[PDB]
Amino acid sequence: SMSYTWTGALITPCAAEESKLPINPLSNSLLRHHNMVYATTSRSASLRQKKVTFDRLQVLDDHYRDVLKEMKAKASTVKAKLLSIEEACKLTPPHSAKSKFGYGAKDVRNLSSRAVNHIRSVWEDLLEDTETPIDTTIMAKSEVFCVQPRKPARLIVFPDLGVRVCEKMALYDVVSTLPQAVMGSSYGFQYSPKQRVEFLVNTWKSKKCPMGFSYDTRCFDSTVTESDIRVEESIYQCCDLAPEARQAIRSLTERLYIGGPLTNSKGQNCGYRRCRASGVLTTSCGNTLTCYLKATAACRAAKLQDCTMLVNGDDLVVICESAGTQEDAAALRAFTEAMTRYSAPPGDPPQPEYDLELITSCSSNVSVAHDASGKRVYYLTRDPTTPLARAAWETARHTPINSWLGNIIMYAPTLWARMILMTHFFSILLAQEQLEKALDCQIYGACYSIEPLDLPQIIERLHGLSAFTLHSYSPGEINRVASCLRKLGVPPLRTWRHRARSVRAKLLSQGGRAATCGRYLFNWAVRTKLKLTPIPAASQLDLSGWFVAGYSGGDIYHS
Numbered sequence: 001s002m003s004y005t006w007t008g009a010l011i012t013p014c015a016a017e018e019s020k021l022p023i024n025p026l027s028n029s030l031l032r033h034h035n036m037v038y039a040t041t042s043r044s045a046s047l048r049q050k051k052v053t054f055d056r057l058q059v060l061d062d063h064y065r066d067v068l069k070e071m072k073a074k075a076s077t078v079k080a081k082l083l084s085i086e087e088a089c090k091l092t093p094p095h096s097a098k099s100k101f102g103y104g105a106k107d108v109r110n111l112s113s114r115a116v117n118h119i120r121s122v123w124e125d126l127l128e129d130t131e132t133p134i135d136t137t138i139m140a141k142s143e144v145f146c147v148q149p150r151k152p153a154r155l156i157v158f159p160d161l162g163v164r165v166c167e168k169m170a171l172y173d174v175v176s177t178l179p180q181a182v183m184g185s186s187y188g189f190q191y192s193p194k195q196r197v198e199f200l201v202n203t204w205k206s207k208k209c210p211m212g213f214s215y216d217t218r219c220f221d222s223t224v225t226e227s228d229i230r231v232e233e234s235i236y237q238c239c240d241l242a243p244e245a246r247q248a249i250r251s252l253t254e255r256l257y258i259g260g261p262l263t264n265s266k267g268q269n270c271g272y273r274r275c276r277a278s279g280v281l282t283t284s285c286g287n288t289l290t291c292y293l294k295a296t297a298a299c300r301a302a303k304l305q306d307c308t309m310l311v312n313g314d315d316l317v318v319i320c321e322s323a324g325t326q327e328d329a330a331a332l333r334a335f336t337e338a339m340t341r342y343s344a345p346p347g348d349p350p351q352p353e354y355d356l357e358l359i360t361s362c363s364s365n366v367s368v369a370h371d372a373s374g375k376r377v378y379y380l381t382r383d384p385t386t387p388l389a390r391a392a393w394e395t396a397r398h399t400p401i402n403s404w405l406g407n408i409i410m411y412a413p414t415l416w417a418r419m420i421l422m423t424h425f426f427s428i429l430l431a432q433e434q435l436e437k438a439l440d441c442q443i444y445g446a447c448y449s450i451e452p453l454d455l456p457q458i459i460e461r462l463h464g465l466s467a468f469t470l471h472s473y474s475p476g477e478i479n480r481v482a483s484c485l486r487k488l489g490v491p492p493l494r495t496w497r498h499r500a501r502s503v504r505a506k507l508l509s510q511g512g513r514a515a516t517c518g519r520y521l522f523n524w525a526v527r528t529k530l531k532l533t534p535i536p537a538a539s540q541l542d543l544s545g546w547f548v549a550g551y552s553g554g555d556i557y558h559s
């Protein structure tokens with residue numbers, strides 16, 4: 001069937017849309033080529049619509065069925081619990097889109113009478129009505145990028161707030177626990193960056209002659225068929241579930257997940273969806289299971305040897321045993337035709353790689369540096385272009401989520417996050433005297449409230465002390481960073497070192513947590529290094545829950 005059907009009504013914005021980077025003194029000190037940074041808007045919606053609208057092709061074979069049964073056998077060991085309305089409400093982000101039924105996220109979090117009453121009625125409706133399609137709103141997502149030698153806005157589809165809370169009650173525990181039970185070490189969201197690196201490195205070293213590749217499906221959500229979504233439900237149904245949760249899951253699958261009507265911000269009928277909605281609770285878990293299922297079966301069909309998968313939603317990395325240059329090339333090609341038959345055609349043909357550093361997944365790749373002892377240490381890095389463009393944007397404009405904070409945490413060991421992001425943002429926080437102000441950021445899609453002054457302990461707990469002593473980065477990594485800065489008009493690293501020494505000094509002079517930030521985060525900036533000892537507060541942090549599952553598009557808030 002067609003992934004989408006359109007009436008002609010336009011995808012409209014519900015407020016003014018900014019697309020250009022402002023000329024701001026704070027942002028200009030970080031990035032001078034402001035005309036190269038832009039934000040997507042509804043103006044490009046039609047372009048995206050054209051790309052994601054097509055008829056799907058899907059042929060399932062014995063390998064697919066074999067793997068599905070293997071996954072279901074594992075899912076059968078799961079017992080999922082039903083979340084109370086209170087628990088579900090508390091998972092709702094403070095700035096989540098308000099309901100059209102007289103209440104907003106703040107009301108939900110406060111368990112106000114009207115919000116809770118409506119949520120209950122929505123729940124009872126899911127238990128009683130097993131067929132009526134649930135309405136969804138379609139919007140053009142606002143994301144920041146750097147012009148390329150422009151990307152049309154992505155389309156987000158989500159149901160009302162009441163429905164979103166009900167999804168949590170019925171499925172939060174399932175999407176938080178089932179993926180790991182089914183996919184084991186292949187489920188990527190169970191890993192912190194260091195652990196992801198650990199898995200990739202060990203998986204690579206375990207092969208006699210490793211060969212690996214990233215497989216990028218063209219607009220994955222649009223490739224997801226009704227069959228895929230019902231197969232996904234069949235996996236969830238293997239869990240021990242409360243009667244109402246089982247019905248809610250059955251109803252949500254038929255009324256929302258497999259598809260439904262699309263309404264624009266103006267309340268006009270835009271069309272119909274018959275594929276994955278980006279803004280529902282099951283998107284991350286469902287895409288991961290779907291991608292893992294198809295690729296695991298595809299490997300068998302293509303005869304790839306010892307395929308080890310690492311899946312994060314639609315992002316897939318495969319590491320296997322090489323059978324020779326020509327053999328691998330033909331097998332990868334066969335893999336692609338198998339995935340194509342399963343309705344997971346590639347955006348760009350995958351290419352076999354024989355060096356782990358050359359494998360890129362969602363712009364990220366593993367690289368190596370050295371600690372104080374001179375020992376090799378692998379870490380996760382990525383092209384800094386988008387992180388820098390977004391940092392500049394969030395510097396000049398107030399945004400609900402601070403990607404820069406999430407990037408500092410996830411890429412703390414990188415040359416660019418340390419020299420640029422830490423330097424730039426701490427200097428600004430110092431100047432505005434807002435170091436102790438908690439900010440919101442996202443990790444694997446879930447929203448977290450974080451205090452900048454706790455970054456030292458956070459980073460130590462997640463990356464280890466070596467994150468504050470890495471040096472001697474690879475030539476390729478250094479070159480990528482340097483060339484990126486020239487492209488964006490970002491001052492050279494020598495300038496950032498100078499700024500860091502001054503920022504470091506100021507932080508030390510204030511003592512307390514601030515001083516700790518200066519000592520640990522900016523030790524790289526001084527010749528006479530300071531003895532960095534394990535931070536007491538670090539070993540006392542409760543980061544249990546940060547890396548359990550993916551929740552992108554799931555409207556999740558962890559407090």
Ligand SMILES: O=C(O)c1ccc(Cl)cc1NS(=O)(=O)c1cc(Cl)c(Cl)cc1Cl
Binds near residue numbers: 201356368378
């Ligand atoms: O060339 C390097 O030094 C290098 C640095 C980082 C990475 Cl990710 C790969 C590299 N090359 S590689 O041949 O794929 C490689 C992979 C692993 Cl798993 C280990 Cl233990 C050592 C090397 Cl040599």
Ligand SMILES: O=C(O)c1ccc(Cl)cc1NS(=O)(=O)c1cc(Cl)c(Cl)cc1Cl
Binds near residue numbers: 415418470497524
């Ligand atoms: O070598 C160190 O002691 C060191 C350790 C970590 C970091 Cl983030 C930077 C370090 N050196 S630095 O002087 O700041 C520096 C490094 C590079 Cl690669 C480049 Cl192009 C330019 C500069 Cl100005």
Ligand SMILES: [Mn+2]
Binds near residue numbers: 312313315362
């Ligand atoms: Mn993805």
Ligand SMILES: [Mn+2]
Binds near residue numbers: 355357
């Ligand atoms: Mn190498």
